[PDB]
Design a protein around this ligand. Sequence first.
Ligand SMILES: OC[C@H]1O[C@@H](O)[C@H](O)[C@@H](O)[C@@H]1O
Ligand SMILES: OC[C@H]1O[C@@H](O)[C@H](O)[C@@H](O)[C@@H]1O
Ligand SMILES: OC[C@H]1O[C@@H](O)[C@H](O)[C@@H](O)[C@@H]1O
Ligand SMILES: OC[C@H]1O[C@@H](O)[C@H](O)[C@@H](O)[C@@H]1O
Lengths: 447, 448, 448, 447
Amino acid sequence: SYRFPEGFLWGAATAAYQIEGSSMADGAGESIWDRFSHTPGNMKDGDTGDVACDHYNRWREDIELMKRLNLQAYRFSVSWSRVIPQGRGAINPKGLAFYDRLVDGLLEAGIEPLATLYHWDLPAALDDRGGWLNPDIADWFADYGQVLFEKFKGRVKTWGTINEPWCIVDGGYLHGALAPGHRSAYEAVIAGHNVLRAHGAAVRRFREVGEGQIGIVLNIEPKYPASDKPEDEAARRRAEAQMNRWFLDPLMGRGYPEELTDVYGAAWREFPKEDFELIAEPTDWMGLNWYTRAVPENAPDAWPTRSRPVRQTQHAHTETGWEVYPPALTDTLVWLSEQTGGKLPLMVTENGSAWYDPPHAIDGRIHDPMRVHYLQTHIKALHDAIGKGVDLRGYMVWSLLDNLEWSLGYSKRFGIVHVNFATQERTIKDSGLFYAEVIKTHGDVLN
Amino acid sequence: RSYRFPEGFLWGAATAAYQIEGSSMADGAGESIWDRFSHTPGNMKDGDTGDVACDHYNRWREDIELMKRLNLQAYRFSVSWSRVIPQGRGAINPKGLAFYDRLVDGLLEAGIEPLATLYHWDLPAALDDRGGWLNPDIADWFADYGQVLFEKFKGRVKTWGTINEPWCIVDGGYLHGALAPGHRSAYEAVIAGHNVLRAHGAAVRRFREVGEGQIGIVLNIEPKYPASDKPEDEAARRRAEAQMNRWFLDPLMGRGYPEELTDVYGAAWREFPKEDFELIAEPTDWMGLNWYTRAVPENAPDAWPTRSRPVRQTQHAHTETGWEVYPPALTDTLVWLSEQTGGKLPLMVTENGSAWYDPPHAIDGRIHDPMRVHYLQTHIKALHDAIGKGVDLRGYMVWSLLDNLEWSLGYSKRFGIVHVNFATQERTIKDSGLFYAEVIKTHGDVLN
Amino acid sequence: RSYRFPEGFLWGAATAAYQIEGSSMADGAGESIWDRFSHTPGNMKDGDTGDVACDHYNRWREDIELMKRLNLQAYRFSVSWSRVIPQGRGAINPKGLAFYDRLVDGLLEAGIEPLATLYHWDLPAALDDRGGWLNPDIADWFADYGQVLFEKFKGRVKTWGTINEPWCIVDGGYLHGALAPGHRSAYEAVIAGHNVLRAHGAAVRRFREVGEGQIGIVLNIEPKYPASDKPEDEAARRRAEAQMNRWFLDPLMGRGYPEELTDVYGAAWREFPKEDFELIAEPTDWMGLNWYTRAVPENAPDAWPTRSRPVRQTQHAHTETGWEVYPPALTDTLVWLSEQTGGKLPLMVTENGSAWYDPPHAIDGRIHDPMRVHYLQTHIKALHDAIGKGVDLRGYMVWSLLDNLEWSLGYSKRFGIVHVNFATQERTIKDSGLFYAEVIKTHGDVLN
Amino acid sequence: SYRFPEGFLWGAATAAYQIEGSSMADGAGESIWDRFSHTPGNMKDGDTGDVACDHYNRWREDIELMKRLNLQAYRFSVSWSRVIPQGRGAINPKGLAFYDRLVDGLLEAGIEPLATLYHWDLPAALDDRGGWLNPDIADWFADYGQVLFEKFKGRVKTWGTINEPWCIVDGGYLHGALAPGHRSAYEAVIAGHNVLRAHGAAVRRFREVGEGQIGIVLNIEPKYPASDKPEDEAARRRAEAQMNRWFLDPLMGRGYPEELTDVYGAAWREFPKEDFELIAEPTDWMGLNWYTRAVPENAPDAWPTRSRPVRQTQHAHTETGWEVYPPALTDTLVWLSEQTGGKLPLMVTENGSAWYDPPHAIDGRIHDPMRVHYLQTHIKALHDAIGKGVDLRGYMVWSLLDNLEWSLGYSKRFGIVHVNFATQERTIKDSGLFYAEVIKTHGDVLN
Ligand SMILES: OC[C@H]1O[C@@H](O)[C@H](O)[C@@H](O)[C@@H]1O
Ligand SMILES: OC[C@H]1O[C@@H](O)[C@H](O)[C@@H](O)[C@@H]1O
Ligand SMILES: OC[C@H]1O[C@@H](O)[C@H](O)[C@@H](O)[C@@H]1O
Ligand SMILES: OC[C@H]1O[C@@H](O)[C@H](O)[C@@H](O)[C@@H]1O
């Protein structure tokens, strides 16, 4: 049987810059992605988030779609620069009003709104003050958090602080593939620390003025052994430490992983103890974003982890080049349960896959059998995790809509709903239809 | 008998924001609990308010020139919380902060050491509406406020006081209701005292994180002497001593709350979580003593809540506030304090002075206050005596630089070494200020 | 002259939690502001407290049997917020809720309609430490508390009161400090009044979302009659009337705040955001009137803050609380109220009664209170007169079922139609109770 | 600091039947404990007071022991049956001669003799006349008192009348665990009343023929709240009334506690006014016997107070099952000071603890660290009480010797001097050594 526990929450997820469009509309400020996406060479095919899914204007239709998919929850992000154009100071009434209407529309539809404070779109005005390199950001973020905490008190009960610190730092400051496009280990170390601090500050502020549950959202990519060679095991631990333990360990009060000292070398720093007290501020829940695993081997020229993944040719790969391997989800869920002591309620805040779909519907249909396969096998893997005692409270499919996959542009479709970006026409994919059955039957359809 | 003071011993004078500044609603400044309290009938003598006071907000330059004439090496002042952060939390008021920026730059330019106090009784009304010192979150609020100053005046203001006289704040503000916010409750008093201590600790920690220099609290102490050899009177003495002098000092030294408080506050007394005391005992760099007089408590079964009352010591002179003049008790207190802090904590007398009657205007360009002069020389000599007994005393601040608003007692109580004509805002240096200027210049040698 | 009352007209009696229950911190129950207030010396007459009161928490079954002997069709009571939610927010106290569960089931079993009041002056102290009625969040806090009750007693308690007498709460608790929490401030009074109204609105909305039945607020009104033809006396009358009778009623009816308040509170008066008034005017199903007397105000320039004072009406009897006995003013008030509510809102007299001297013990099994009997008969007749004049009046509750704690005036003021011997907790039905029982039985015909 | 007031008297206490032995020797009459202890089932292990500490023969050795301990006072009781064999009538010359020798020996040693008239050993001939149920005992006792008052005039200056009325009545008449082994509430009420009357009569007689100071000795066991349940507070007040206020209140002229009407029900009685005038005869001092506190909860089947103590597992317990909790001593002293108006000089006539000791010394030593701990903490608690204005004039350790703990036999050792009951060998315990140091330094050893 695959019936899920009582109260288990099924939903789907999005992010502001990836779907909203209208980036400068109605008072909204400039974000780092406004700058980044309009700089030549940064984005595939020169794609930008200027229009995206036009969600800012078509959110009502999108909610009708959520209802057709039988969604019980919708996880979304709030654009900081849309709400506070300069990052600090005067609030933008219309910008806040958008999310106000959105949340009311969701509650009317019977859909639980899951809000994320930061999904990679820092206000440019704050980037001009150093962004995540400026320790004061811990306060800025907190204040920003407060604006929402008070505005949606009693309506938004489940809060995420930061979405994937590792992507923000590794993509934004270490390798520069993401906004703000810096490439520096020194900056990567500092930015990671201040992201954690910002999370802690926001949680404290939430304790003072908020109502409900708050937590961080981490992505994890489990690193499997390439061989029994010791240099490869050392490589595996470097990669695992840099990607999976960098943020989790200090969040659990265990400090930074020792291996980071080797990974970042002269760029590594010692931080004040009270910083770690702030960072480990107790949370109510944790989100896991999960897609795949990796099999790292030693790679002396790979900066900075000196490791590289070994291609697992025995399995299918997504268009983002990610191995399809459902058991590794179960394992990860087990592992995380151990790291949090079984004491912290967990939720899969993102899971999904990118495969090729045509740019238009084919007489009113999009047939994506591999996305369907991914969905069913990984959800079964969730059931396996719950059977092993992991406290899993919910599952959010990434993503509700085909959207802007950041620097990879619109070429990577993660949606269970197809978006024709020429016409903004939405078409429910076979995967969405199937997910609607999984929700409807509460998992029994997998039988 | 020589009376030259140690090298580097700092001479100065002290004030507080609401008592001298005026312009309480000016340039974005928020409403404080004293704006409300002073504008409620019956609370203040003669209906006096801090609306104008010494008009210091406008006349600070003149006041600095006066500091120069007095040869002051230090000026101890407080920052109005609501002037800088009108709602207590949130948005900063640029002009309000700019005032203190101007003041500090002006002091440093004059060669005067600025000694800043974060809290001198003027809580933002917006925070009082959220429970004030009864709300534990105030510990955080204060810290944030502290941070704003710590960063703004980093490298300029090196000596920081967190809270000025927790006992006056709580006993006056929450226990008996003679001071803002005018509550009268033992239940509220214990909680308020606890959260005042917590706020101090939080501020010291925040200072360790973001600040530069030395930080400490300022306590008032009124030594309790035996009225008789009767045992109920000694029990009374220890109750009064516990409620006034040990309530805050003991947990600050990591010694927990005085046991006698359980008897003083009875059912209103509470046990608090262990980590609170860890926060409260956060190590400081220095401590300020506010000292004026002693008391001689006797048993008084109907006196709530300490069941004690002072015996009038008619053998000695008394001030306009009714405080006995008795300099040896200063020396004793300093010694006592040195012992309570283990001799390891550098001390400074952050307030000492006396109130006597002065006319409302100068008399041919003069104010003759021989009793204030007497108080001054005898108590400064007492400081020297304390130093000779091994007390690590680093400085002395006269209360006060200016005749000002003595809170609920209004303008009727003059503590200034500089006379203020409140009709014309004209300043006239008193004989006491004059003498003090000579004490500073001779570094104490004038007393010989 | 017949005095038969309308079909379905509901006869009952009323109490309040802190005034009768005792066991105030028992079985998990939290500390309330009255726990603190009553145990501070000087606040209560003879040092009386609500620690024991009528011991109703333990003797509620006996009291129900007493209700049955009086032929009561309804019992109006309040729920102690801190008994049900000890910290005001957060965890529910199962035993505390279980008490009211048993009480309500017992009432329904006896055929007696339970009329429940959410707030009768006993705020949890933990919420007072967060600013109490000065903190806007209380509107939410109250709502959540309301929900707990609405759902627990869904289908059992069909008639709900939100707030009992906003004016006594604010004027007594925040303006003059005669009631808990004992603040004295016009600034605080204005803010507190606004937040009480907001809390009422929030509770009504929450009731619409999760509740079942009819909900409304309970106002006290003291009609102000002319003292003379002097225009300053009429201005005085209008000030007093605005501050006491129109302050809350007008915004509840969507008319905004009385203009005269701008004059009454001066610099303490504030403008509030427009949406607050949308919240305050949330449509209700019924309204309660608490009524005892009238006043005849004259100009009094030194009377803070209404600058008015009542003229003693020596031509009429006065109760032991010093209130004039004048039944026609009840009729007038009801008519007035009917006019202010457009005749559209069902009204109920939720409190009416009188305090006269009774001995502390029964005298051969009896308590003879002919003046209380007189008050009862004349004012009930006045109710009938009011109905004849078109007031949509659905019921009448005698204050009070039991001799109880008259707050700051202690046990010295007996309002009961049932005598309580506070030495022994023995109940004895007074002559007034006997007469009221006959009034209910004959549905008014005894008045013929 | 812990220096005690000048003239503060340090000593130790015993009781006749618990240490003397030779109970019917040298003309001595039969006491109720002679009968009770020789009836099967009454005493643990069948222990009796036939030998005990053989003090009747070894008192000189015991005085040398007092001197080694630096005792300034020795509190002891006189066996009524040893002095007046039939309780009334002829005096027994030898029996009185023993206490004469003892008192002279003590005064010779510089030790202040503190004499107790009655310590639970009523003459059997008087028990056959109804004992404490016969009102005439008030007179009998007076006569007995007179015999001592006149014999030791000028030598014994501090007199106790009755030792612990509550134990006598509750143990002897209510529950029957002590001699004379009655179990009756009716009898308990009557006996309590006549004990109080006997005290008064003895005080009057002392006024007529005696010299010095006279007073009663009460045991108090302060009752603390078990919960916020009202039935438990009613329980607390019942227990408090029956144990702590039953005797103190009429002694202070306040009549009997109202709660007794509830406790004893139909067995409760109203007594003549003049009885209460006799009972309240002004005294010169009062003794407090103190050991522990109790935390009573409601217990409907517990006769007659319908209360029972709740085990306080957070604290140490003695071998008698008594919680170790020194602050309750301080509180009690204050309470007593208040009940007596602060005008009546108080003395702790008994305080101590029972812990396991081996039956023989090792090596010529007894290491009793918990008894030492009890000693230091409770003496410190006395100091705390003095600091709060309580007029406390002295402290007597129970007990000088390991002895017969009545019905619990010799299994409960209270001595600061160990007694090997096989050999009558005395060994001063570590507690005795420490106490000797406390006396010598007048408290300075505590700091
Ligand atoms: O890369 C695919 C997805 O990865 C997730 O971890 C990020 O949160 C999304 O913003 C992104 O679209
Ligand atoms: O109350 C008398 C004076 O002494 C101290 O308590 C305060 O610091 C002064 O501001 C106050 O005016
Ligand atoms: O002031 C007398 C009475 O006023 C009423 O309106 C309140 O509801 C009662 O609690 C109070 O006893
Ligand atoms: O129970 C231990 C001790 O208790 C005391 O109160 C009695 O007076 C002693 O005789 C007894 O040995």
